Coordinates of C-alpha atoms and ligand atoms in Angstrom, one line a residue:
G1 CA -24.7 -29.0 52.0
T2 CA -26.7 -30.3 49.0
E3 CA -24.8 -28.1 46.6
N4 CA -21.4 -29.2 48.0
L5 CA -22.6 -32.8 48.1
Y6 CA -23.7 -32.6 44.4
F7 CA -20.9 -30.3 43.3
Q8 CA -17.9 -31.6 45.3
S9 CA -15.4 -30.3 43.2
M10 CA -14.5 -28.0 40.1
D11 CA -16.9 -25.3 39.0
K12 CA -19.8 -25.6 36.6
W13 CA -17.7 -24.7 33.6
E14 CA -15.7 -28.0 34.0
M15 CA -16.6 -30.7 31.6
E16 CA -15.3 -34.2 30.8
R17 CA -13.0 -34.3 27.8
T18 CA -14.9 -37.3 26.5
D19 CA -18.0 -35.1 26.1
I20 CA -16.3 -33.8 23.0
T21 CA -15.6 -35.9 19.9
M22 CA -12.6 -34.0 18.4
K23 CA -12.7 -34.0 14.6
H24 CA -10.0 -32.1 12.8
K25 CA -7.8 -29.0 13.2
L26 CA -9.5 -25.7 12.3
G27 CA -7.8 -23.4 9.9
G28 CA -4.7 -25.4 9.0
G29 CA -2.7 -23.9 11.9
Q30 CA -3.8 -20.3 11.5
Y31 CA -5.6 -20.3 14.9
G32 CA -3.0 -22.5 16.6
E33 CA -4.1 -25.7 18.5
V34 CA -7.8 -25.2 17.8
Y35 CA -10.0 -28.1 16.6
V36 CA -13.5 -28.5 15.5
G37 CA -15.4 -30.9 17.7
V38 CA -18.9 -32.2 18.4
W39 CA -20.3 -31.8 21.9
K40 CA -22.1 -35.1 21.8
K41 CA -24.9 -34.6 24.3
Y42 CA -26.1 -31.7 22.3
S43 CA -25.0 -32.8 18.8
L44 CA -23.4 -29.3 18.8
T45 CA -20.3 -28.4 16.7
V46 CA -17.8 -26.5 18.8
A47 CA -14.3 -25.0 18.6
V48 CA -11.8 -26.4 21.1
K49 CA -8.5 -24.8 22.0
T50 CA -6.0 -27.3 23.5
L51 CA -2.7 -27.3 25.1
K52 CA -0.7 -30.6 25.0
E53 CA 1.3 -32.1 28.0
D54 CA 4.6 -30.4 27.3
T55 CA 4.6 -26.6 26.7
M56 CA 5.7 -23.4 28.7
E57 CA 2.3 -21.8 28.4
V58 CA 0.2 -23.5 31.1
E59 CA -0.2 -20.3 33.2
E60 CA -1.4 -18.2 30.2
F61 CA -3.8 -20.9 29.1
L62 CA -5.3 -21.2 32.7
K63 CA -5.6 -17.3 32.9
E64 CA -7.4 -17.2 29.6
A65 CA -9.9 -19.8 30.8
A66 CA -10.2 -17.8 34.0
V67 CA -10.8 -14.5 32.1
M68 CA -13.4 -16.1 29.8
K69 CA -15.5 -17.3 32.7
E70 CA -15.8 -13.6 33.8
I71 CA -17.1 -12.1 30.6
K72 CA -20.3 -12.6 28.7
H73 CA -21.6 -10.6 25.8
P74 CA -23.6 -11.2 22.6
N75 CA -20.6 -10.0 20.5
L76 CA -17.8 -11.9 22.4
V77 CA -17.3 -15.5 21.4
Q78 CA -19.2 -17.7 24.0
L79 CA -17.3 -20.0 26.4
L80 CA -19.1 -23.3 26.7
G81 CA -16.8 -25.1 29.1
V82 CA -13.3 -26.1 30.0
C83 CA -11.1 -29.1 30.8
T84 CA -8.5 -28.0 33.4
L85 CA -8.1 -31.0 35.6
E86 CA -5.2 -32.7 33.7
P87 CA -3.5 -32.1 30.4
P88 CA -4.3 -31.7 27.6
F89 CA -6.4 -28.8 28.7
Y90 CA -9.4 -27.6 26.7
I91 CA -11.2 -24.4 26.3
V92 CA -14.4 -25.0 24.4
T93 CA -16.4 -22.2 22.6
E94 CA -19.2 -22.0 20.1
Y95 CA -18.2 -22.7 16.5
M96 CA -18.8 -19.7 14.1
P97 CA -19.9 -21.0 10.8
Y98 CA -18.5 -18.2 8.6
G99 CA -15.0 -18.3 10.1
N100 CA -12.9 -15.1 10.7
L101 CA -14.0 -11.7 9.6
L102 CA -11.0 -10.8 7.5
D103 CA -11.3 -13.9 5.3
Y104 CA -15.1 -13.4 5.2
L105 CA -14.7 -9.8 4.0
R106 CA -12.2 -10.8 1.3
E107 CA -14.2 -13.8 0.0
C108 CA -17.8 -12.6 0.4
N109 CA -20.4 -11.7 -2.2
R110 CA -20.8 -7.9 -2.0
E111 CA -24.4 -8.0 -3.3
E112 CA -25.2 -9.6 0.1
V113 CA -22.6 -7.7 2.2
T114 CA -24.0 -4.3 1.4
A115 CA -23.3 -1.0 3.2
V116 CA -25.9 -1.7 5.9
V117 CA -24.3 -5.1 6.7
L118 CA -20.8 -3.4 7.1
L119 CA -22.4 -0.9 9.5
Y120 CA -24.0 -3.7 11.5
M121 CA -20.8 -5.6 11.7
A122 CA -18.8 -2.5 12.9
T123 CA -21.5 -1.6 15.4
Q124 CA -21.4 -5.1 17.0
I125 CA -17.7 -5.1 17.4
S126 CA -17.9 -1.7 19.0
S127 CA -20.5 -3.1 21.4
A128 CA -18.2 -5.9 22.5
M129 CA -15.4 -3.4 23.1
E130 CA -17.7 -1.0 25.1
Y131 CA -18.5 -3.9 27.4
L132 CA -14.7 -4.7 27.8
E133 CA -14.0 -1.0 28.5
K134 CA -16.8 -0.9 31.0
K135 CA -15.5 -4.1 32.8
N136 CA -11.9 -2.7 32.8
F137 CA -10.5 -5.2 30.3
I138 CA -8.1 -4.5 27.4
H139 CA -8.1 -6.7 24.3
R140 CA -4.5 -5.9 23.1
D141 CA -4.9 -7.5 19.6
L142 CA -8.0 -6.2 18.0
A143 CA -8.2 -6.8 14.2
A144 CA -10.5 -8.3 11.6
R145 CA -8.5 -11.6 11.7
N146 CA -9.5 -11.9 15.5
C147 CA -13.2 -11.5 14.8
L148 CA -15.6 -14.3 13.9
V149 CA -18.8 -14.3 11.8
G150 CA -21.9 -16.3 12.6
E151 CA -25.3 -16.8 10.9
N152 CA -27.3 -13.6 10.1
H153 CA -24.2 -11.3 10.0
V154 CA -23.5 -11.7 13.7
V155 CA -20.0 -10.8 14.4
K156 CA -18.1 -11.6 17.6
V157 CA -14.8 -10.4 19.0
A158 CA -12.3 -13.1 19.8
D159 CA -8.7 -13.4 20.8
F160 CA -6.8 -16.4 19.3
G161 CA -3.6 -15.4 21.1
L162 CA -1.4 -15.8 18.0
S163 CA 1.6 -13.4 18.1
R164 CA 3.5 -16.6 17.3
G165 CA 4.3 -13.5 7.8
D166 CA 4.9 -9.8 8.7
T167 CA 1.6 -9.2 10.6
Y168 CA 3.5 -9.8 13.9
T169 CA 7.1 -8.7 14.1
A170 CA 9.6 -8.5 17.0
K171 CA 5.8 -9.8 18.6
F172 CA 3.6 -6.9 17.6
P173 CA 1.2 -6.4 14.5
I174 CA 2.7 -3.1 13.7
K175 CA 0.0 -1.8 11.5
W176 CA -2.7 -2.2 14.1
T177 CA -0.6 -0.9 17.0
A178 CA -1.0 2.5 18.6
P179 CA 2.1 4.8 18.6
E180 CA 2.4 4.7 22.4
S181 CA 2.3 0.9 22.3
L182 CA 5.1 0.8 19.6
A183 CA 7.3 3.4 21.3
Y184 CA 6.7 2.6 25.0
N185 CA 5.0 -0.8 25.2
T186 CA 2.0 0.9 26.8
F187 CA -1.4 -0.8 26.1
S188 CA -4.8 0.5 27.3
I189 CA -8.4 0.6 26.2
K190 CA -7.2 3.7 24.2
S191 CA -4.7 1.6 22.2
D192 CA -7.6 -0.8 21.5
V193 CA -9.5 2.2 20.1
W194 CA -6.6 2.9 17.7
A195 CA -6.7 -0.8 16.6
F196 CA -10.5 -0.6 16.1
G197 CA -9.9 2.3 13.7
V198 CA -7.6 0.1 11.6
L199 CA -10.3 -2.7 12.0
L200 CA -12.9 -0.3 10.6
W201 CA -10.7 0.5 7.7
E202 CA -10.5 -3.3 7.1
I203 CA -14.3 -3.4 7.1
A204 CA -14.5 -0.4 4.8
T205 CA -12.1 -1.9 2.3
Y206 CA -13.5 -5.5 2.4
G207 CA -10.3 -6.9 4.0
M208 CA -7.5 -4.9 2.4
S209 CA -4.1 -5.1 4.0
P210 CA -3.5 -1.7 5.8
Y211 CA -1.0 1.0 4.8
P212 CA -0.8 0.0 1.2
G213 CA 2.1 1.7 -0.7
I214 CA 4.0 2.0 2.6
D215 CA 7.0 0.1 3.9
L216 CA 6.6 -1.4 7.4
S217 CA 9.8 0.2 8.8
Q218 CA 8.4 3.7 7.9
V219 CA 5.0 3.5 9.6
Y220 CA 5.7 4.9 13.1
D221 CA 7.7 7.9 11.6
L222 CA 4.8 8.6 9.2
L223 CA 2.1 8.5 11.9
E224 CA 4.2 10.8 14.0
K225 CA 4.5 13.4 11.2
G226 CA 0.7 13.1 10.9
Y227 CA 0.2 10.7 8.0
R228 CA -3.0 8.6 8.3
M229 CA -4.5 6.1 5.8
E230 CA -6.7 7.7 3.2
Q231 CA -10.5 7.5 3.1
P232 CA -11.3 4.2 1.3
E233 CA -13.3 4.2 -1.9
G234 CA -17.0 4.6 -1.1
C235 CA -16.4 5.2 2.6
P236 CA -19.0 7.5 4.0
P237 CA -17.4 10.7 5.4
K238 CA -18.9 10.0 8.8
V239 CA -17.2 6.6 9.0
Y240 CA -13.9 8.1 7.9
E241 CA -14.3 10.9 10.5
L242 CA -14.7 8.2 13.2
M243 CA -11.6 6.3 11.9
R244 CA -9.6 9.5 12.1
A245 CA -10.8 10.1 15.6
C246 CA -9.6 6.6 16.6
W247 CA -6.2 7.5 15.2
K248 CA -5.6 10.7 17.2
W249 CA -2.0 10.8 18.3
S250 CA -2.7 11.2 22.0
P251 CA -4.7 8.4 23.6
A252 CA -6.8 10.8 25.7
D253 CA -8.2 12.5 22.5
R254 CA -9.5 9.2 21.1
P255 CA -13.1 8.5 21.7
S256 CA -14.3 5.8 24.2
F257 CA -15.9 2.7 22.8
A258 CA -19.2 4.0 24.4
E259 CA -18.9 7.1 22.2
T260 CA -17.9 5.0 19.2
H261 CA -20.9 2.7 19.6
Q262 CA -23.0 5.9 20.0
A263 CA -21.6 7.2 16.7
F264 CA -22.5 4.1 14.7
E265 CA -26.1 4.3 16.2
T266 CA -26.3 7.9 15.1
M267 CA -25.4 6.8 11.5
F268 CA -28.4 4.6 11.4
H269 CA -30.7 7.4 12.6
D270 CA -29.2 10.0 10.2
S271 CA -29.2 7.9 6.9
Ligands
STI1 C1 -19.5 1.6 8.0 C2 -19.3 1.5 6.5 C3 -18.0 1.5 5.9 C4 -17.8 1.5 4.6 C5 -18.8 1.4 3.7 N1 -18.6 1.3 2.4 C6 -19.4 1.2 1.4 O1 -20.7 1.1 1.5 C7 -18.8 1.0 0.0 C8 -19.3 1.7 -1.1 C9 -18.7 1.6 -2.4 C10 -17.6 0.8 -2.5 C11 -16.9 0.7 -3.9 N2 -17.4 -0.5 -4.7 C12 -16.4 -0.8 -5.8 C13 -16.8 -1.9 -6.8 N3 -18.2 -1.7 -7.3 C14 -18.7 -3.0 -8.0 C15 -19.2 -1.4 -6.2 C16 -18.7 -0.1 -5.4 C17 -17.0 0.1 -1.4 C18 -17.6 0.2 -0.2 C19 -20.1 1.3 4.2 C20 -20.4 1.5 5.6 N4 -21.6 1.4 6.0 C21 -22.4 2.4 6.4 N5 -22.0 3.5 7.0 C22 -22.8 4.4 7.4 C23 -24.2 4.3 7.2 C24 -24.7 3.1 6.6 C25 -26.0 2.8 6.4 C26 -26.4 1.9 5.5 C27 -27.8 1.6 5.3 C28 -28.7 2.2 6.1 N6 -28.3 3.1 7.0 C29 -27.0 3.4 7.2 N7 -23.8 2.2 6.3
STI2 C1 -11.7 -22.3 21.0 C2 -11.4 -20.9 21.6 C3 -10.8 -20.8 22.9 C4 -10.5 -19.6 23.4 C5 -11.0 -18.4 22.8 N1 -10.8 -17.2 23.4 C6 -11.1 -16.0 23.0 O1 -11.5 -15.7 21.9 C7 -10.9 -14.9 24.0 C8 -11.6 -13.7 23.8 C9 -11.5 -12.6 24.7 C10 -10.6 -12.7 25.7 C11 -10.5 -11.4 26.7 N2 -9.1 -11.1 27.0 C12 -9.1 -10.0 27.9 C13 -7.5 -9.8 28.2 N3 -6.8 -9.4 26.9 C14 -5.4 -9.4 27.5 C15 -7.0 -10.6 26.1 C16 -8.5 -10.8 25.7 C17 -9.9 -13.8 25.9 C18 -10.0 -14.9 25.1 C19 -11.6 -18.5 21.6 C20 -11.9 -19.8 21.0 N4 -12.6 -19.8 19.8 C21 -12.0 -20.0 18.6 N5 -10.7 -19.9 18.5 C22 -10.2 -20.1 17.3 C23 -10.9 -20.3 16.2 C24 -12.3 -20.4 16.3 C25 -13.2 -20.6 15.2 C26 -12.7 -20.6 13.9 C27 -13.6 -20.9 12.9 C28 -14.9 -21.0 13.2 N6 -15.4 -21.0 14.4 C29 -14.5 -20.8 15.4 N7 -12.8 -20.2 17.6

C-alpha cells in the first residue's frame, strides 16, 4: 500500500548519483576506482567506489554492495548508499580522515600513538572480526593496509578488493596468508585469524613490512619448519603470546576472534 506507493522501486540504500559531487581520486590509484565526494544534502565528505561502463567485474561489484547492506558494526566501514540502477555503479561509504592504518602507523607521531592507543586500535579490529565470525562471514584479506582510521583513534576494518609490488603475487599477499590458504586455497575465519596475527605485528612495529630478513619464496617452508616472526621491540609478552596463538599451524588450534577480543580486554584489566 502506502509503502509500495511511496517506495515503488529499489531499496532504501539506493541514491541518485547526482546527490554526490565527485571531487578527485583518493589515494592516487592505491584503492582502485575510489573517489572523494561530497554528499550535498548533508555537506558530508564521503568515499565512493565506482565501476565504469566496460569491465568484467559487474557481478563482484553487485555482490559487494549486497554484502555491505547486510553488515553493520562500529568497526566496519559504514555503507551510506549505492547507485546500482545503471553504470557507472557507486558504493558510497563514510570518509575516514586519517586514511589507511598502515600509512598512519608509519607516518604518525609516537608521542600521541602510545601503547594504550595501539591496544585500542587492535581491540577494535578484533571486535569487527568477532562480528564477522559470528555472522558467518570471512574477510579473506585482513591487513593494516585494509583498515581505516577516523577521529579519536577509531579504527575500522575495510576491504578495498585490491589483489590487482610484491604484496600480492600469483593473487595472494603471501606474508599475510595462512599455510592452508597458500597450500590448498582453503580460506576460513581461521585463516583470517592468522592474518590478524600479522596485522597485530604491523601494529606492534608501527607498520614494518613483515618477515624482514627473509626471501618471499622461502616463507611457506620456514613456517612449516616452525619459524615465526620474532617478538617486536617493546612488544608486551602478552601481545606476542596472542600473535603466536594466531599463528598456530593447524587452523583449529588458533583462537576465535571472540577469544582474541577477550584477550585484549583482559590486557586492559591486568595492566
Ligand atoms: C598491543 C600493543 C602492541 C605493541 C606495543 N608496543 C609498545 O608499546 C612499544 C614500546 C616500545 C617501542 C620501542 N620504541 C623505540 C623508539 N623509542 C623512541 C621509543 C621506544 C615500540 C613499541 C604496545 C601495545 N599495547 C598494549 N599492550 C598491552 C597493554 C597495553 C596497555 C597500555 C596502557 C594501559 N593498559 C594497557 N598496551
Ligand atoms: C568506497 C568504499 C566502497 C566499498 C567498501 N567496501 C568495504 O570496505 C568492504 C568491507 C567489508 C566487506 C565484507 N566482505 C565479506 C566477504 N569477504 C569475502 C570480503 C569482505 C566488504 C566490503 C569500502 C569503501 N570505502 C573506502 N574504500 C577505499 C578507500 C576509502 C577511504 C580512503 C581514505 C579515507 N577514507 C576512506 N574508503
